[PDB]
Design an enzyme around this catalytic site. Structure first.
Site, PDB file in Angstrom:
ATOM      1  N   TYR A   3      62.161  17.563  70.817  1.00 29.85           N
ATOM      2  CA  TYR A   3      62.264  18.994  70.201  1.00 29.85           C
ATOM      3  C   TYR A   3      61.886  19.133  68.861  1.00 29.85           C
ATOM      4  O   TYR A   3      61.537  18.002  68.103  1.00 29.85           O
ATOM      5  CB  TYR A   3      63.753  19.401  70.127  1.00 29.85           C
ATOM      6  CG  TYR A   3      64.694  18.757  69.044  1.00 29.85           C
ATOM      7  CD1 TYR A   3      65.214  17.439  69.174  1.00 29.85           C
ATOM      8  CD2 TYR A   3      64.779  19.261  67.850  1.00 29.85           C
ATOM      9  CE1 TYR A   3      65.937  16.591  68.116  1.00 29.85           C
ATOM     10  CE2 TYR A   3      65.347  18.608  66.871  1.00 29.85           C
ATOM     11  CZ  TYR A   3      65.908  17.469  67.001  1.00 29.85           C
ATOM     12  OH  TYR A   3      66.654  16.799  65.916  1.00 29.85           O
ATOM     13  N   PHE A  11      62.488  22.304  58.503  1.00 30.70           N
ATOM     14  CA  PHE A  11      61.926  21.832  59.838  1.00 30.70           C
ATOM     15  C   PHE A  11      62.536  20.231  60.219  1.00 30.70           C
ATOM     16  O   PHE A  11      62.578  19.452  59.376  1.00 30.70           O
ATOM     17  CB  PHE A  11      60.477  21.881  59.405  1.00 30.70           C
ATOM     18  CG  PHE A  11      59.483  21.788  60.657  1.00 30.70           C
ATOM     19  CD1 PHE A  11      59.190  20.541  61.389  1.00 30.70           C
ATOM     20  CD2 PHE A  11      59.045  22.739  61.309  1.00 30.70           C
ATOM     21  CE1 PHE A  11      58.651  20.519  62.455  1.00 30.70           C
ATOM     22  CE2 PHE A  11      58.344  22.935  62.289  1.00 30.70           C
ATOM     23  CZ  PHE A  11      58.077  21.844  63.032  1.00 30.70           C
ATOM     24  N   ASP A  12      62.670  20.108  61.438  1.00 32.34           N
ATOM     25  CA  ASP A  12      63.193  18.833  61.954  1.00 32.34           C
ATOM     26  C   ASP A  12      62.484  18.825  63.280  1.00 32.34           C
ATOM     27  O   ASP A  12      62.393  19.575  64.076  1.00 32.34           O
ATOM     28  CB  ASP A  12      64.583  19.294  62.205  1.00 32.34           C
ATOM     29  CG  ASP A  12      65.433  17.812  63.014  1.00 32.34           C
ATOM     30  OD1 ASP A  12      65.078  16.600  62.624  1.00 32.34           O
ATOM     31  OD2 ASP A  12      66.358  18.038  63.701  1.00 32.34           O
ATOM     32  N   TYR A  40      75.416  27.663  63.533  1.00 30.07           N
ATOM     33  CA  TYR A  40      76.264  27.001  62.731  1.00 30.07           C
ATOM     34  C   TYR A  40      77.101  28.298  62.020  1.00 30.07           C
ATOM     35  O   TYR A  40      78.094  27.940  61.062  1.00 30.07           O
ATOM     36  CB  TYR A  40      75.575  26.344  61.579  1.00 30.07           C
ATOM     37  CG  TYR A  40      74.903  25.024  62.057  1.00 30.07           C
ATOM     38  CD1 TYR A  40      75.760  24.021  62.476  1.00 30.07           C
ATOM     39  CD2 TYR A  40      73.581  25.162  62.786  1.00 30.07           C
ATOM     40  CE1 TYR A  40      75.223  22.707  63.102  1.00 30.07           C
ATOM     41  CE2 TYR A  40      73.179  24.057  63.257  1.00 30.07           C
ATOM     42  CZ  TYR A  40      73.865  22.902  63.265  1.00 30.07           C
ATOM     43  OH  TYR A  40      73.258  21.763  64.121  1.00 30.07           O
ATOM     44  N   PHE A  87      63.882  26.662  68.151  1.00 29.90           N
ATOM     45  CA  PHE A  87      63.642  25.408  68.960  1.00 29.90           C
ATOM     46  C   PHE A  87      62.502  25.423  69.786  1.00 29.90           C
ATOM     47  O   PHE A  87      62.491  26.494  70.678  1.00 29.90           O
ATOM     48  CB  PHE A  87      64.563  24.609  69.380  1.00 29.90           C
ATOM     49  CG  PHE A  87      65.948  24.320  68.380  1.00 29.90           C
ATOM     50  CD1 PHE A  87      66.790  25.330  67.943  1.00 29.90           C
ATOM     51  CD2 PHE A  87      65.984  22.861  67.866  1.00 29.90           C
ATOM     52  CE1 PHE A  87      67.767  24.857  67.125  1.00 29.90           C
ATOM     53  CE2 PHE A  87      66.942  22.604  67.094  1.00 29.90           C
ATOM     54  CZ  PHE A  87      67.928  23.662  66.677  1.00 29.90           C
TER      55      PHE A  87
END
Ligand code: A1INK
Length: 128
Positions: free
Chosen positions: A45, A55-56, A101, A118
């Site tokens: 992902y 960003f992850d 969240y 995502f």
């Protein structure tokens, strides 16, 4: 961008039909099977705040992200979204705060009332 496309083309995959989790299938997967609650799920992902300030990417760890579906090990939007996915599928999710969240956020990383995006690839799932 991709988030706006999901706002406009995305399927509302919430039970409440509150547009809290919108989905576009970007690459169709294989077989009819989608994972069940409790299954061990393997994904790649990339994720971002809708404003793109954080960003992850699992790709940055070069290794799948692994979680058990439907146990709230991840935000509610993933339990809902990944449950709809076929092995090999890539999907985009746009996620209102209620399914991520919330009002509290997850500071300092995630602000109050944050919308999340995502891209997710379902690599595999397997029974408990
Ligand atoms: C709120 O904290 C994080 C949120 C997010 C990523 C985080 C978080 O730091 C713990 O770390 C990235 C390092 C790898 N990793 C992922 C996880 N744990 N470690 C699952 C954590 C739970 O995450 C989620 O439920 C969702 C779905 C699964 C992938 C990660 N998710 C996130 O919310 C991301 C977040 C990061 C900022 C951009 C938006 C996505």
């Amino acid at each position: 961008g991709a988030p706006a496309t999901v706002t406009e083309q995305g399927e509302d995959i919430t039970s409440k039909k509150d547009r809290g989790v919108l989905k576009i299938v970007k690459r169709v997967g294989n077989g009819e099977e989608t994972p069940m609650i409790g299954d061990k799920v393997y994904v790649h992902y990339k994720g971002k705040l809708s404003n793109g300030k954080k960003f992850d990417s699992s790709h940055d760890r070069n290794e799948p992200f692994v979680f058990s579906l439907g146990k709230g090990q991840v935000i509610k939007a993933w339990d809902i979204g990944v449950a709809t996915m076929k092995k090999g599928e890539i999907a985009h999710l746009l996620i209102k705060p209620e399914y991520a969240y919330g009002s509290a956020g997850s500071l300092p990383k995630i602000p109050s009332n944050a919308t999340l995006f995502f891209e997710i690839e379902l690599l595999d799932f397997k029974g408990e």
